[PDB]
Amino acid sequence: LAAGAVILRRFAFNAAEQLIRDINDVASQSPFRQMVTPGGYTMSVAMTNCGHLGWTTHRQGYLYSPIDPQTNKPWPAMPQSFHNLCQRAATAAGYPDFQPDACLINRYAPGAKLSLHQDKDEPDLRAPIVSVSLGLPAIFQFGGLKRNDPLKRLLLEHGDVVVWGGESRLFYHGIQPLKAGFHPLTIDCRYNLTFRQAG
Ligand SMILES: O=C(O)C(=O)N[C@@H](CSCc1ccc2ccccc2c1)C(=O)O
Ligand SMILES: [Fe+3]
Secondary structure: OOOOEEEEOOOOOOOHHHHHHHHHHHHOOOOOEOOEOOOOOEOOOEEEEEEOEEEEEEOOEEEEEOEEOOOOEEOOOOOHHHHHHHHHHHHHOOOOOOOOOEEEEEEEOOOOOEEEEOOOOOOOOOOOEEEEEEEOOEEEEEOOOOOOOOOEEEEEOOOOEEEEOHHHHHOOEEEOOOOOOOEOOOEOOEEEEEEEOOO
């Protein structure tokens, strides 16, 4: 399916309410914002981060920064719920040493999407990324190592966690425009957490 990826469906289902509380807490400090791409377009996905580092635009490029450029303060500390869930998932998937210092939190309103990309900016690409999906379902599309590799699609639903290791860590991937709907925990949106070793 995706070589090296370990899909754990509903792994975060029981933790989801706490996770969402923690997302709200994080956002009360560093608010969700829609970043501007180099190229000048406003992303449809809104973002924030927690942990020592967080992903952001700066100076018409992207990077991991210890300071949130919007507040000029550090990103909020990584919530225990986040840290512990990530560790359980990574450990089950065979990455017991994974120690994320960054968690990017993506929020999707109806229609929001994430264009096909690789995550290339972490210092060691042997370290996995761990995603946790919450709320409304989204169609995840994924390629291969080359931009033009044939795309496959799978639905990511509430509570689904995936550890993207091995070859899959390098795949081009994205999220297709979110279908509108209702979810009891998130109301009208989807959240996705991605845990990274950025330092
Ligand atoms: O944050 C990202 O970089 C990202 O692409 N997030 C999407 C997709 S989740 C699945 C996912 C996340 C990160 C990956 C990083 C490397 C390879 C495969 C990945 C798959 C989202 O917000 O739902
Ligand atoms: Fe990505």
